[PDB]
Amino acid sequence: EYEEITLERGNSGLGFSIAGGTDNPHIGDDSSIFITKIITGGAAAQDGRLRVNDCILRVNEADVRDVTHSKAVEALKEAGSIVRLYVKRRKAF
Numbered sequence: 001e002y003e004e005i006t007l008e009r010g011n012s013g014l015g016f017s018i019a020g021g022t023d024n025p026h027i028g029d030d031s032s033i034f035i036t037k038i039i040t041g042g043a044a045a046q047d048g049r050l051r052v053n054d055c056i057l058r059v060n061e062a063d064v065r066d067v068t069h070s071k072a073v074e075a076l077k078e079a080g081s082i083v084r085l086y087v088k089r090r091k092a093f
Helices: 043-047 069-077
Strands: 005-007 016-019 034-038 083-086
Antiparallel strands (some): 016 034
8 A cells, every 4th residue: 555745845944854864964785765754844744644664655746765864854845846756665564
């Protein structure tokens, strides 16, 4: 099951936060950064944005799995007006 979320841009804090660590905070093999928390009180929360805690599959139709910490923050922010995130979840066991 996959559900894409197309939210609008912000200005200085959409409302949701993200965590990452490819080569900025500490060395690592997995560049794919994950979400930490969705802070209510922003364009993101206003339109929606659920509580995430994992890495996104793609951003703005492009995979941002090739970034650093400061790049990921900008990869979204600099994504443009409307930002669309795709997330898929497979069922098993």
